[PDB]
Design a protein around this motif. Structure first.
Motif, PDB file in Angstrom:
ATOM      1  N   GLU A  90       0.791  -1.339  -0.022  1.00  0.00           N
ATOM      2  CA  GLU A  90      -0.102   0.068   0.044  1.00  0.00           C
ATOM      3  C   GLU A  90       0.957   1.327   0.133  1.00  0.00           C
ATOM      4  OE1 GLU A  90      -2.140  -0.654   3.495  1.00  0.00           O
ATOM      5  OE2 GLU A  90      -3.629  -1.947   2.762  1.00  0.00           O
ATOM      6  N   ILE A  91       1.637   1.485  -1.048  1.00  0.00           N
ATOM      7  CA  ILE A  91       2.472   2.522  -1.188  1.00  0.00           C
ATOM      8  C   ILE A  91       1.791   3.817  -1.205  1.00  0.00           C
ATOM      9  CG2 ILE A  91       4.135   3.487  -3.058  1.00  0.00           C
ATOM     10  CD1 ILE A  91       5.719   2.267  -0.677  1.00  0.00           C
ATOM     11  N   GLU A  92       0.661   3.979  -1.947  1.00  0.00           N
ATOM     12  CA  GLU A  92      -0.042   5.171  -2.021  1.00  0.00           C
ATOM     13  C   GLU A  92      -0.678   5.496  -0.594  1.00  0.00           C
ATOM     14  OE1 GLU A  92      -1.521   2.178  -2.239  1.00  0.00           O
ATOM     15  OE2 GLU A  92      -3.071   2.234  -1.268  1.00  0.00           O
ATOM     16  N   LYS A  93      -0.556   4.859   0.486  1.00  0.00           N
ATOM     17  CA  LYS A  93      -0.899   5.277   1.865  1.00  0.00           C
ATOM     18  C   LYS A  93       0.417   5.936   2.536  1.00  0.00           C
ATOM     19  CE  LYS A  93      -4.734   1.924   2.827  1.00  0.00           C
ATOM     20  NZ  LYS A  93      -4.958   0.576   3.669  1.00  0.00           N
ATOM     21  N   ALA A  94       1.413   5.803   2.244  1.00  0.00           N
ATOM     22  CA  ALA A  94       2.524   6.213   2.952  1.00  0.00           C
ATOM     23  C   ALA A  94       2.503   7.781   2.984  1.00  0.00           C
ATOM     24  CB  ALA A  94       3.755   5.862   2.375  1.00  0.00           C
ATOM     25  N   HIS A  95       3.031   8.309   4.096  1.00  0.00           N
ATOM     26  CA  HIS A  95       3.084   9.860   4.232  1.00  0.00           C
ATOM     27  C   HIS A  95       4.083  10.298   3.195  1.00  0.00           C
ATOM     28  CE1 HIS A  95       2.352  13.656   6.113  1.00  0.00           C
ATOM     29  NE2 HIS A  95       3.844  13.695   6.270  1.00  0.00           N
TER      30      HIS A  95
ATOM     31  N   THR B 266       3.625  -2.208  -4.020  1.00  0.00           N
ATOM     32  CA  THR B 266       2.256  -2.656  -4.289  1.00  0.00           C
ATOM     33  C   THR B 266       1.410  -1.663  -4.159  1.00  0.00           C
ATOM     34  OG1 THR B 266       1.349  -4.043  -2.354  1.00  0.00           O
ATOM     35  CG2 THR B 266       3.271  -4.935  -3.404  1.00  0.00           C
ATOM     36  N   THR B 267       0.244  -1.618  -4.844  1.00  0.00           N
ATOM     37  CA  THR B 267      -0.919  -0.711  -4.379  1.00  0.00           C
ATOM     38  C   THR B 267      -2.032  -1.318  -4.818  1.00  0.00           C
ATOM     39  OG1 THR B 267      -1.400   0.348  -6.520  1.00  0.00           O
ATOM     40  CG2 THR B 267       0.472   1.221  -5.420  1.00  0.00           C
ATOM     41  N   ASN B 268      -3.137  -0.959  -4.149  1.00  0.00           N
ATOM     42  CA  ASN B 268      -4.615  -1.749  -4.432  1.00  0.00           C
ATOM     43  C   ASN B 268      -5.385  -0.521  -5.400  1.00  0.00           C
ATOM     44  OD1 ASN B 268      -3.832  -3.965  -3.527  1.00  0.00           O
ATOM     45  ND2 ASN B 268      -5.282  -3.732  -1.476  1.00  0.00           N
ATOM     46  N   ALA B 269      -4.747   0.319  -5.993  1.00  0.00           N
ATOM     47  CA  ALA B 269      -5.535   1.184  -6.849  1.00  0.00           C
ATOM     48  C   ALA B 269      -6.117   0.771  -8.019  1.00  0.00           C
ATOM     49  CB  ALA B 269      -4.360   2.090  -7.553  1.00  0.00           C
ATOM     50  N   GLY B 270      -5.729   0.128  -8.875  1.00  0.00           N
ATOM     51  CA  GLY B 270      -6.537  -0.729  -9.926  1.00  0.00           C
ATOM     52  C   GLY B 270      -7.396  -1.709  -9.392  1.00  0.00           C
TER      53      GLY B 270
ATOM     54  N   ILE C 149      -3.129   6.122 -11.950  1.00  0.00           N
ATOM     55  CA  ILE C 149      -1.828   6.191 -11.394  1.00  0.00           C
ATOM     56  C   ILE C 149      -1.232   7.668 -11.530  1.00  0.00           C
ATOM     57  CG2 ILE C 149       0.572   5.095 -11.513  1.00  0.00           C
ATOM     58  CD1 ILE C 149      -0.853   2.484 -11.953  1.00  0.00           C
ATOM     59  N   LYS C 150      -1.084   8.216 -12.740  1.00  0.00           N
ATOM     60  CA  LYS C 150      -0.615   9.390 -13.103  1.00  0.00           C
ATOM     61  C   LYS C 150      -1.356  10.262 -11.907  1.00  0.00           C
ATOM     62  CE  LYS C 150      -0.384   8.842 -17.869  1.00  0.00           C
ATOM     63  NZ  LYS C 150      -1.035   9.199 -19.249  1.00  0.00           N
ATOM     64  N   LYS C 151      -2.517  10.119 -11.543  1.00  0.00           N
ATOM     65  CA  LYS C 151      -3.045  11.121 -10.639  1.00  0.00           C
ATOM     66  C   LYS C 151      -2.275  10.831  -9.207  1.00  0.00           C
ATOM     67  CE  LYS C 151      -7.767  11.707 -10.146  1.00  0.00           C
ATOM     68  NZ  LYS C 151      -8.119  13.307 -10.177  1.00  0.00           N
ATOM     69  N   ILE C 152      -2.705   9.810  -8.730  1.00  0.00           N
ATOM     70  CA  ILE C 152      -2.449   9.419  -7.181  1.00  0.00           C
ATOM     71  C   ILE C 152      -0.889   9.466  -7.045  1.00  0.00           C
ATOM     72  CG2 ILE C 152      -4.462   8.137  -6.563  1.00  0.00           C
ATOM     73  CD1 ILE C 152      -2.963   5.664  -7.446  1.00  0.00           C
ATOM     74  N   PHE C 153       0.108   9.396  -7.987  1.00  0.00           N
ATOM     75  CA  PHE C 153       1.337   9.432  -7.849  1.00  0.00           C
ATOM     76  C   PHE C 153       2.164  10.694  -8.423  1.00  0.00           C
ATOM     77  CE2 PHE C 153       2.263   5.519  -5.704  1.00  0.00           C
ATOM     78  CZ  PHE C 153       1.288   4.825  -5.509  1.00  0.00           C
ATOM     79  N   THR C 154       2.886  11.249  -7.530  1.00  0.00           N
ATOM     80  CA  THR C 154       3.516  12.478  -7.989  1.00  0.00           C
ATOM     81  C   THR C 154       4.279  12.095  -9.296  1.00  0.00           C
ATOM     82  OG1 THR C 154       5.202  12.071  -6.374  1.00  0.00           O
ATOM     83  CG2 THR C 154       3.334  13.323  -5.770  1.00  0.00           C
ATOM     84  N   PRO C 155       4.466  12.972 -10.124  1.00  0.00           N
ATOM     85  CA  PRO C 155       5.407  12.626 -11.554  1.00  0.00           C
ATOM     86  C   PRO C 155       6.810  12.673 -11.073  1.00  0.00           C
ATOM     87  CG  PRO C 155       4.006  14.449 -11.928  1.00  0.00           C
ATOM     88  CD  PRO C 155       3.927  14.326 -10.308  1.00  0.00           C
TER      89      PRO C 155
END
Ligand SMILES: Nc1ncnc2c1ncn2[C@@H]1O[C@H](COP(=O)(O)OP(=O)(O)O)[C@@H](O)[C@H]1O
Ligand SMILES: Nc1ncnc2c1ncn2[C@@H]1O[C@H](COP(=O)(O)OP(=O)(O)O)[C@@H](O)[C@H]1O
Ligand SMILES: Nc1ncnc2c1ncn2[C@@H]1O[C@H](COP(=O)(O)OP(=O)(O)O)[C@@H](O)[C@H]1O
Lengths: 552, 568
Positions: A387-392, A426-430, A438-444
């Protein structure tokens, strides 16, 4: 000092002392220091297993060989045994008496030098020699580590000024090759073997890559001596004495607590069928396995980058598709460890310090880090972050610096090497919609640093049947270790597959379904003794009961 | 002379040494270490009495048989018997001159290897072996344990650059049986008895659950010796050479003093009826007891992961319902000890370090952490961690590691065996939410499900590894009546021991029970309320002349719901 010290001139003149190679600069520095009138006391600063003791032996060798300035000639280097000197006194006067006897027996020879290996134990005593070695009569060769120096020295400035720090560093790769080349003939004479130059270079490079408990010039010599010993033991098979790269890899894996031969050339056999043996352990998402194994082989081919991790992989897709399964099987295949973290616990602002460690003075400092600590403990593992998209975002800055430079700094100043780990997130986005998400949630700045983004498609119903059959065959082999056979009807497999699978949860409930539906009933029959050695478990589904029935 | 250096090669040639059983890879490691030109001094680290002397004897034997490379095929080995050279001098000068004499004698005996038994005690005449280190031409094989190794060797460069530790692990069950069979015929000759292979098999399978003093290949042989000695001596006219598993369990009961019927003759009988055994002693919570028994049975069946612990259960529900009593009776039923720690004391990481045994945080890190040494003492016991929700998250990390691998290593080179340990944690989190008064006019509004607060407290990573989560409900009025009656009979025992009889009306029992039961603490305030409502007036009477030595007091209630005291 007849019984307290060893005459190193009498020792280099007979043998045991090996030639010192590649230390012309440091030897010249020690000599130049020894030519001073006052405070001519060299202090060798290095680490464990860097060859500090080899400096004094080489100096005694050059003395007995005359390869020194005539001013440095006629000097006798004494190596004292601290066991005889310090221990066994037990009273207030004996140690000073021994010390003064040693000093007097040193006074009779005004040109003799005393060399105290590891001079940090006798100091913390030290006030007994500060006036003797200040400017009066005695020159002492000291050898300490950087830590022991910076801890015991630099505090007693009167002793820091009475010694000359000589910065002994570990030799480079090619210098290690030259040193082991010069040291080869003696081990060849002892072990009656021969080392190839390829084996020499391979041993040095593998000692650098895998053996991180000691330093280069000593662990390299140790691995060649161990390879020579292994080739000397091999005549139990009556083999030839030549020691090739294979023996070196075997002994390296033996020493670094690494699976045997998992380093250089059996890896060719594994990477030959890596994707295949993965597809036999994970089902579905086969193009994902293809791309992942492609990147793995890309990194292993020696074409990757040294100042980045082995791979920075993002696993995008719904849960229960086997991302963690792919990861753990990748770890098991390559014989490397597995590091598992969940960013669910590091979503807060204060939690980021749990990875690297709190700064000095604050709570949890002596706790150290958790990421850097595990990485230092296991430099070859594959890093799994759930769940990398949850990390601070601070964790994201840490991971950015990691993926960009491949190294982290512990709060104690140690260096955590990431160039040998595979960074898997790993992420549970999709597809294109998942990519845009993925472009949205993750910074370029983070996406641009990624090696490859791996998408995990949804699990298909035949794949669910395959995973439920995987569970069934695992239970079957488990029962065969016990000695009871098992039958499962096809409709029972279909019911288990449909009941234990959810589009929103994947194959996660499958373990629970398998357990509570098969292991429990069978455990009763087995433990209570109704089903014993020689039975056969049957699984029948009745639509009017929707339960699984069995028998002997 | 020869009264100080013994060549055990002659002992191996004359049959005094039997070949070693297994551990051939340790022999190969020792040989390749002795083959080195530098750092060629092997060191055996491990438990005491696991066959280190046996490893050296088997290696010397193999050299006699020529199972080694041609370089050490002709070499002779010597054993150091310190007592012979040491005793009979009692003079420091004589001690040191004997030291010099032995040094010169062994130097004349060059091309030989000296085996030093328990070299850690020779190093700490520390100046006796330093000549051997300074010479370096002489190889030495030693023996040490993890404690002495960590105390002496890891901090000394002069020893580290000479010796390599050989981690000797205790053999498997079948390897122990092979060693027992190898050592069996000579003891059968000495003890004039005969034991079966199944006899020694049940012997080791029982010793593994009786061993709390020393590991496998140091105690099963002693069990066999005791069995032989008793079978030869127990009967005066009879000579029962047939030593069966009943004889082994008889010796186990004779030495350990635990009844053989409670442990050795009951392999599964109490396990098959464990649930009613617990329900017989714990009043209520029958569903929780049944769930616990079913889980532990499914574990004992063996259709799972052998590495995982026996059981990992989180006991939820209000305290004071007997969860600790349930664990106590579970420990007593399995005949295993109860290792318990109140997690309220490990809310700080500098104490979690002490729990594990990390070098910082506590003095005495040579002894390791509490949990590790405890599970080492009893690899069969039950683990109780009360108030688990208080512990530092690093305790949760360690519990996750254990529930994932079932083994905890220590910072002294030791491992913890969890595959025969069942872990039980108790908490009361969420039960505070069952007494949360709502706001509406009704405000009952709930039969609260504490499951949400539970999953909120314990991270899904941890609770995902639970073998089960056991929920304990409130005690029924009959359960509370039984517990207050138990308090009553306890008070009655105390009073009759004092010499005063007591009687209580059943209505008073119901009143005390319904008053002293708190849905937040169960029946824990019952002891206090029983005390305040009974022992105080009876003590007042006992000290102030109404009753002094004898008497009788009855108890009843009024219409005001008050206790009524009836004197003499
Ligand atoms: N330049 C060199 N030439 C020959 N041998 C070397 C050289 N450098 C290191 N070695 C060898 O590597 C080992 C280093 O051991 P040493 O430095 O004495 O340990 P420590 O520094 O911990 O006291 C020695 O065996 C030494 O002979
Ligand atoms: N593609 C797959 N092939 C085989 N088994 C799978 C697969 N996906 C999930 N599983 C099963 O689901 C369980 C673990 O799922 P997990 O890897 O944790 O899902 P995710 O990585 O998406 O969070 C295991 O029992 C695993 O066998
Ligand atoms: N079913 C019961 N049978 C016997 N005693 C009980 C029962 N229920 C509660 N008790 C009594 O109330 C006490 C509650 O103890 P417990 O809830 O386990 O708290 P602790 O954490 O201190 O062990 C028990 O020790 C017991 O004396």
């Amino acid at each position: 000092m007849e019984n307290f010290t060893t005459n190193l001139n009498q020792l280099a003149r007979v043998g045991g002392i090996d030639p010192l190679i590649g230390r012309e600069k440091e030897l010249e520095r020690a000599i130049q220091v020894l030519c001073r009138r006052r405070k001519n006391n060299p202090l060798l600063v290095g680490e464990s297993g860097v060859g500090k003791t080899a400096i004094a032996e080489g100096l005694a060798w050059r003395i007995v060989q005359g390869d020194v300035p005539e001013v440095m000639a006629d000097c006798t280097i004494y190596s004292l045994d601290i066991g005889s000197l310090l221990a066994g006194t037990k009273y207030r006067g004996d140690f000073e008496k021994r010390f003064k006897a040693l000093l007097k027996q040193l006074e009779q020879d005004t040109n003799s030098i005393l060399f105290i290996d590891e001079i940090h134990t006798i100091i913390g005593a030290a006030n007994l020699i500060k006036p003797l070695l200040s400017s009066g009569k005695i020159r002492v060769i000291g050898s300490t580590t950087y830590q022991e120096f910076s801890n015991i020295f630099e505090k007693d400035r009167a002793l820091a000024r009475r010694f000359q720090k000589i910065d002994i560093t570990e030799p480079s790769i090619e210098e290690t090759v030259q040193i082991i080349n010069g040291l080869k003939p003696k081990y060849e004479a002892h072990h009656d073997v021969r080392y190839t130059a390829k084996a020499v270079r391979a041993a040095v490079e593998l000692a650098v890559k895998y053996i991180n408990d000691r330093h280069l010039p000593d662990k390299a010599i140790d691995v060649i001596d161990e390879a020579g010993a292994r080739a000397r033991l091999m005549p139990v098979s009556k083999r030839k004495k030549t020691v090739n790269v294979a023996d070196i890899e075997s002994v390296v894996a033996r020493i670094a607590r690494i699976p045997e031969k998992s380093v250089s050339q059996s890896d060719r056999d594994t990477l030959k069928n890596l994707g295949d043996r993965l597809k036999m352990l994970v089902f579905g998402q086969d193009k994902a396995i293809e791309a992942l194994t492609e990147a793995i082989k890309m990194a292993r081919a020696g074409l990757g980058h040294e100042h980045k991790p082995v791979g920075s992989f993002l696993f995008a897709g719904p849960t229960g598709v086997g991302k963690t399964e792919v990861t753990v099987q990748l770890s098991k295949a390559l014989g490397i460890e597995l590091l598992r973290f969940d960013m669910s616990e590091y979503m807060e602002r204060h939690t980021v310090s749990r990875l690297i460690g709190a700064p000095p003075g604050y709570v949890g400092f002596d706790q150290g880090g958790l990421l850097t600590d595990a990485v230092i403990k296991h430099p070859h593992a594959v890093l799994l972050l759930d769940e990398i998209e949850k990390a601070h975002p601070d964790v994201f800055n840490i991971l950015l610096q990691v993926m960009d430079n491949g190294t982290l700094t512990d709060n104690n100043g140690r260096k955590a090497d990431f160039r040998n780990v595979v960074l898997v997130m790993t992420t549970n986005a999709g597809s294109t919609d998942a990519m845009e998400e993925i472009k949205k949630i993750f910074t370029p700045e983070f996406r641009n640093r990624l090696d490859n983004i791996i998408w995990f498609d949804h699990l298909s119903t035949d794949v669910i049947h395959q995973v439920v059959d995987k569970f069934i065959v695992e239970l079957q082999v488990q029962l065969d270790q016990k000695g009871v056979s098992l039958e499962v009807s096809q409709e029972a497999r279909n019911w288990l597959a449909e009941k234990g699978y959810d589009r929103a949860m994947g194959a996660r409930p499958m373990a629970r379904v398998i357990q509570d539906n098969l292991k429990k009933p069978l455990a009763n029959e087995l433990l209570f003794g109704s089903l014993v050695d020689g039975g056969q478990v049957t699984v029948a589904l009745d639509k009017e009961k929707n339960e699984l029935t069995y028998g002997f």
